[PDB]
Amino acid sequence: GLKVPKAVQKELPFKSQIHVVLGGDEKKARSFIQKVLTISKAKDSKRKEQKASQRKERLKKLAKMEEEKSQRDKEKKKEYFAQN
């Protein structure tokens, strides 16, 4: 964890300062909902990182193909200004 010294955490500006239950079916159902919640959370985190790693290769492929198309267009306007 982020550990700070006491000599610098006791001396800081104000705004930038690091500032009954049932036994049984109720609590087992609450842990059941906790189970399905962490299931859903790990699942769609997997989904979102998969999408981000997909748009990684999308960005790289698009970047190299726009690079070569931009150089082809620049040699096109180069020869167009060369045929003056």
Vertex 50 angle, CA 44 and 53, to 5°: 145
Nearer Cβ to another protein (5/23): 5
C-alpha 82 chain-centroid distance: 47
CB of 11 vs another protein, minimal distance in Å = 5
Nearer Cβ to another protein (38/71): 38
Task: Write out the residues near another protein by the rule CB under 8 A.
Answer: 2, 4, 8-9, 11-16, 19, 29-30, 32-33, 35-40, 42-44
Contact assessment for residue 17 and residue 10, using Cβ atoms and an 8 Å cutoff: no
Q: Which amino acid is at 4?
A: V
Nearer Cβ to another protein (15/74): 15
